[PDB]
Symmetry: D2
Subunit: 352 residues, 4 copies
């Protein structure tokens, strides 16, 4: 019957280590670590792609409409963030290689680079990094480096629906936004307008003081920010600039989930939103730890005469944060008592 090594195809996995230093008659011990570290990253990238694809499919094929499937969705997205955390920690292993020792085999690698990781690109694309928003390296598209079936795979990855698009569509259907129903947006605008009015009166009532002056200034900022939320044209503009990514309606859905997270139907949805932010934060942390290591190994100016260091530093940016809108919902937090009430009267549609 089945044996461990055969089941795991270890005849492949453990016969995939060839030191170029050794192939060229000058074996360097630490090259082995370099190979294994990358192979382990690639195994885990494959696992992340497997989870991510399964979740994309749940959205894309309509299964997510049945809320029974939310546990699996959140459990798999949580699993992705648990793997990503391990991948961040994994840099600690390669940090046991000194720059001096790396320098003894670096020449035998040229011109290969991590830039050519198919899976890393697939992962970026499938989460929803927009091609127009990528920073070019040496004034080139990232995919220009790939050919054949690999280029085909990358194209599919760009053309098929991303996790961002699939979550967007689902957020747009969030219960409670219906004007004929709970009319979340209408009530929210009204309550925020009234809340600001009340606050203005409170501040104006205060005795002339430095404190008052500050409160006035703060109020003015807060007022502008909160009212700006209801400007759909500003949203479209920011969407155009890439400072936002979600449709206006999806943003409404996300805020509905945020404010009514304790309501039973929104509990697991809220966890999903939290998890999407976690993935974005951990992807950025991966990129940051990668940058620090490139610096430690090559210096601040080495790279393909573009500085790899500086290109990579540019990737550590909201430009590569797909669910940046979920983070920015913090900007629009209001006092709890301003949140449109959901009494049992109307608290029927958010029970399981």
């Amino acid at each position: 019957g089945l044996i461990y090594g055969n089941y795991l195809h270890l005849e492949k996995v453990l016969n995939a280590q060839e030191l170029q230093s050794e192939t060229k008659g000058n074996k360097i011990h630490d090259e082995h670590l370099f190979i294994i570290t990358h192979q382990a990253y690639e195994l885990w990238f494959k696992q992340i792609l497997w989870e991510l694809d399964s979740v994309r499919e749940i959205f894309q094929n309509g299964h997510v409409r049945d809320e029974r499937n939310m546990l699996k969705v959140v459990s798999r997205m949580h699993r992705v963030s648990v793997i990503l955390k391990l991948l961040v920690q994994q840099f600690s292993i390669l940090e046991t290689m000194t720059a001096l020792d790396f320098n003894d085999f670096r020449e035998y690698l040229s011109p290969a680079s991590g830039f050519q990781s198919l899976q890393f690109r697939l992962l970026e694309n499938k989460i929803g990094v927009l091609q127009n928003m990528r920073v070019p390296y040496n004034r080139r598209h990232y995919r220009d480096n790939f050919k054949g079936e690999e280029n085909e795979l990358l194209l599919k990855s760009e053309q098929e629906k991303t996790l961002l698009e699939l979550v967007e569509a689902w957020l747009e259907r969030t219960p409670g936004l219906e004007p004929h129903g709970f009319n979340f947006w209408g009530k929210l605008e009204k309550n925020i307008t009234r809340g600001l009015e009340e606050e203005f009166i409170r501040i104006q009532a205060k005795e002339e003081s430095e404190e008052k002056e500050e409160q006035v200034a703060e109020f003015q900022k807060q007022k502008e920010v909160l009212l700006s939320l209801f400007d759909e044209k500003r949203h479209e503009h920011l969407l155009s600039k890439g400072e936002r990514r979600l449709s206006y309606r999806a943003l409404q859905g996300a805020l509905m989930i945020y404010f009514y997270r304790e309501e039973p139907r929104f509990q697991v949805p809220f966890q999903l939103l939290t998890s999407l932010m976690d993935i974005d934060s951990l992807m950025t942390k991966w990129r940051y730890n990668h940058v620090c290591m490139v610096h430690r190994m090559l210096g601040s100016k080495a790279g393909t005469g573009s500085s790899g260091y500086h290109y990579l530093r540019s990737t550590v940016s909201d430009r590569y944060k797909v669910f940046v809108d979920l983070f920015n919902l913090s900007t629009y937090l209001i006092p709890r008592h301003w949140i449109p009430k959901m009494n049992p009267t109307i608290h029927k549609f958010l029970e399981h």
Copy 2:
């Protein structure tokens, strides 16, 4: 020109994932995680073997005699412990699989098991786990599973010099033990004997009391422990039982390094000893985390035949599997600093770089 995927042989690594659930017409999503997790463990086991073999070779071929090589030795042993820590954390990934989901593909795995990891066994053997100390599973030898070249490799792993044996030989050469020289052992025995004598007199002077008895009783325990160190015959006996692993002379070398760790020639040696203990501790932590997960997935009774896997694995979390137990137990023989034989520059020339 060399390309990433070719250099890393990703055509092998990323085409090694076959779900038995799918091969048998009933694909179960979480099986993929189970495969990848194990493959990642095995890659890192290969890396640990590569580091450990390189260090064994440095000892075995005499390179360690040139102390310029101690930095490399300690850096590679430190690297092994950094990998082991990652491997302990890696269980957190498999903990995202529920027992209920594992149960949907478990049947398609039988009768394969992690028990059949060649590399894990190679690692245990090369560090220095003794075959006669291993606990039998279902009243069977661990090697009974393996056949052909695999069984051959395991035998070599048992017959070749282990890390423990190679460190032992090097410890036996530790400077300072020469009776004609610094005479560490003789001076230590003398100072401990005198120190105990002095302490006894202090205690005896006290007036008969419960407190005095307690002090007297404590002194007697401490006395027995410390003096037991100089009983070479007791050591040989305990070595016979497998309760100790290092030769008496190697034990002397280790304690020399412990007590004179700050002396320049002993600084990196001390770090090495620390690192060997770290590896033992992390190997045990791996075993423990593995146990907790087997329990969560299979329950306390599930296992091959009437034997419980859980209970066998629990049994592996024991000093029986701690190769450098003697290095840990040197803390038992701590004395006041002023009892430590002095090493004035006059007699320090030998421990300078």
Copy 3:
């Protein structure tokens, strides 16, 4: 104006470090690390108690009956396990102290011990460690080591409802167990009986066969044992189990129907309770390994004894893995009744 240091009462927190080595005219550098490490453990124990008490209260006052409160419950229990993981990692700091350096100030500590952590005991009791199940230290009860108000607090901690008891009561009310309703237990027994019957027949149709026969026999005994309420009561008496038979039924209902909307967050709670038990055990294990490294080959053997199912409060949740069946044996839940969850 509120200032950081005043808000955090740093005049207290950062003036609480007194080296006994220094008080006795022989300052030892590493003693400072020993003090801070323990103070950090105690701050986090206080936080764990704060979370755990808030959750006990949500159960005890009936708030948990409104399922709107489940997110907060699971979020706070998850928070406890996140803190416990940090506390496990925190041992890595104290591991930078050698045994030789510890030995230079150890004498000045006597006769104080970590054993006397009030908060650690409060935490054990509030989770649900039973006093009669504790391993004796020096042939005596753990509480004998405490006096005054502290002894009083520990008694309250034992007498007040534990997390285990409060979860138990909630599990007993789990929807689906009603014989007049979905009749989970009845259907489960029936389906397991049938499933075993079917398997036997297949088996009856070789070395392999012998093995499968053996397996079947073990599985059969185990699965049928689940329906023996008397054996359960006996094991409860021996302390080998902790939850009532009815609570066990509730937990299995949640396990099997975890995807059903009303059970999704409850399942996360059960998962989290096991996590806390596992991390508490890991804390105890890492503590043992450190004591060994510091003192040698005994407190060591008493501590080793605490790394046991004896101190696993939610051991019943772990052991439900033993009673997993093929998915197709699980009583079906369709719209006919599905709506109840």
Copy 4:
């Protein structure tokens, strides 16, 4: 007899938790976590200061001259980095607080901020962050927020010798730099010059491939030869783009290249550890940024944007140790150190 609680002064530590939400008649559960998290950070900052001060003192009092003390030095610096790692992981606890829940007690905190952590500033100063290099927040000096004894302490922290300065002095005394002795710098310049000559010949002996090699050679040549420009170094020192004296830089490179030599093994570990502390300090700052973002948004001079600015070489004290990787050469170019000339090492 001493009791645990008394020894640890738990009557202070465990009676230091006062929720402002509760003081103002509206207790918010998560405020307790916010307080404890910060108190735990501050305990560990105290420990880091205690280790760092002990190491500064070993340098400053001449004890480091006795190489017996290098193990203690490196062990304590390693300990600092192990604590810093825990402090980075500790953010995972505060991340279990949602922004919505933080928003329920945030108002009761105003106008307090982590910016007012005395110990964090003391730590920055004692490692060697320069005041003139700090980025202003809201067009203000960082110390403007401190008064009394606290401001006094911060002054001393700036005036007293920093870890950077103490390491610098020790690096300047590194064996091997003597022109009358092993003459490291002279030999290195000579070997690099010759090595470049040899490579040029190979290039001349040879297309776009050749052209690429030509371009590379030119870049490498400029970089490597720039190392021997003492004047450029002094200029960059003036700007604050470098921190170590030219002589200290030579000492560091000596240790780098001859790390395996017994006398340099633990010194090399020290240099590695100093870089680790810089990396971990930056990682702390970055994890802090990500959290502030999640909690306040990108707008709430935005704190988020100021903090992002602190993740920069501007705050990297041992940047020179990192940048020595730029000046790596083939091993065979490194001046040989035969036992003959090894006795000193």
